[PDB]
Protein: yjht
Amino acid sequence: SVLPETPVPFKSGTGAIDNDTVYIGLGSAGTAWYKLDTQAKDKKWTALAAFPGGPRDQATSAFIDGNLYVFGGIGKNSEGLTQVFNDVHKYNPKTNSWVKLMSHAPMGMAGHVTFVHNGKAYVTGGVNQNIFNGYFEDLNEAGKDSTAIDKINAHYFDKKAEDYFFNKFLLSFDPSTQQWSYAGESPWYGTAGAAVVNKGDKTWLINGEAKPGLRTDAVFELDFTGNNLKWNKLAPVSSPDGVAGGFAGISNDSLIFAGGAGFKGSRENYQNGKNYAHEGLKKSYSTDIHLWHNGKWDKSGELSQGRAYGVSLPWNNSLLIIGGETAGGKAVTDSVLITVKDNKVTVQN
Amino acid sequence: SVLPETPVPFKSGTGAIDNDTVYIGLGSAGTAWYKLDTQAKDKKWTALAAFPGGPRDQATSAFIDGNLYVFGGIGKNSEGLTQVFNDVHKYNPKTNSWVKLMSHAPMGMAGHVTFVHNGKAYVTGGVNQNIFNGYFEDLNEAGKDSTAIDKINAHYFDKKAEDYFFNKFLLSFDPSTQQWSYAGESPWYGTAGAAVVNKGDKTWLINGEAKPGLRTDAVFELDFTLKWNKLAPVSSPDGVAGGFAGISNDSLIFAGGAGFKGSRENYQNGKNYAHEGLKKSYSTDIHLWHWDKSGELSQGRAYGVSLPWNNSLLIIGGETAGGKAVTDSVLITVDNKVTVQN
Structure:
């Protein structure tokens, strides 16, 4: 809308901005990537070279030093089964060409976040590759046996959050060496589907799944201002249950957090000892827009329709939201711009 | 040899004891398993059903409620590449049959330890499966290209220990459910090739690699009466990996293992590739904690099977200097003093 409609319905994808040029791809777009020059009079999505690593849901991407890097995601292995990837691809916009890097992340990456700090891509969060991949291996083995399927599901969902080993480590990828380093770790727990925002020496990790079907309303701050990385629990948002797949950006010096999806009542079920916290519940999509302004959160506006699992980009001191999924799991093609004209939010779509 | 010679030379294998019967297999024995009745007057190794998961180096095992469980190890995937496994097999000694369990450990398991506590198998340690598997994938892609091989090796070895993500988590496997749970995590770091000893609610993790080519002299104590303690180090300053550990008459023994003399110094001086150029040394040292050197093996030995037997430490097989696997077993007993039976 605020940009032309994406060429296909676009959920679970990824994207990046390099100054005034927006790049989007993957998710329900398959191997397709597109770019758009936001400063053109006749704004247009231009199809780029196809992603060579197959379709990916829940990949991330970072622009660093003129090149676009894509990390992980969920897709098919050589046997045709759903799995989590741990790879990195590089796209060179000057040559419209992709290469896969010889680079091995220590953890699979799906539901992870990625941000750029001091010329490096930093990654945290995501599901555990062995648990996630094993679920699909088991379902494949079960075939059409519903009793076998029920057993697999029962075992899978009846665990405490810690037993899913969501990634609490902080990893850094250096484009110059293509190597992965230990950068730190959360004193608390990892999530899958948190929203990330970075501004200078601060990064924020907002909500996310703590385990399959259970989200957190937590907000973590990573403070890189000192000699040692410091982690802080900030005031929560989207309480009590939290969302996953929300959108986030910074407008002025105030964080914007919008949308996301979740299961209402699930936190209370888990707190009450039901590990399978979302059993029987229907997924709902948030319309809330929260602003973190002068160090405090407030519900400041709303989206017209609930939305999760799209692309969030900084643009013109605003949060640019592109695509996503709405009620019924329907992918959308439109874009929204959330700007703060203090101390209040405005929404364009 | 204390027990009869193993039917084939036997390094990097695994084993367990259930009452009087010793079970050993894998490593350089391939898929073979054997058992021995330690009460027989003519002790012998009896061949069992072969392991169906292919050859495995650095697997572990636990005997729990009448069944033998085998965890992970290094072996070949469907396409012939070396990799780390995350699986569990169960051997029923009554039917002499194996089954692969539908069970998914959250980490690969090679260089891990395993011990039994309150009817569960506890696992910690080991390499990171993506880094380890990635290395062999890269060497497979490179082929005969020396330039590429050199680059792969340079990147692989030139990292800080923390960058290898050796497993510091403590995992528990419950035979009754076949599921894996979070049981805790080390306040320090994980290792590959630590020696483990459990007695009651206490477990000791001794030495091990902190990264490829660098060992630790650390000794950790897990107390389930879970609390994590760091004890006085042993095999300082460099440490070993693949050593043998046991308890004898309340004394904690640590024997053997292999290391690279001066690697810790190199690492401390900023050489990440801490063992570049060096030859492995295999230790004959035997230490008792009271740590005091108390005896000596006749030859350096690492990467065999350690078992508790008659209040002694039974060592079966292992690797020796130059890589030669051996077939003999050794018994180490502690009154405040060590005696090595060969």
The helical segments of chain A are 129-142, 146-157, 266-271.
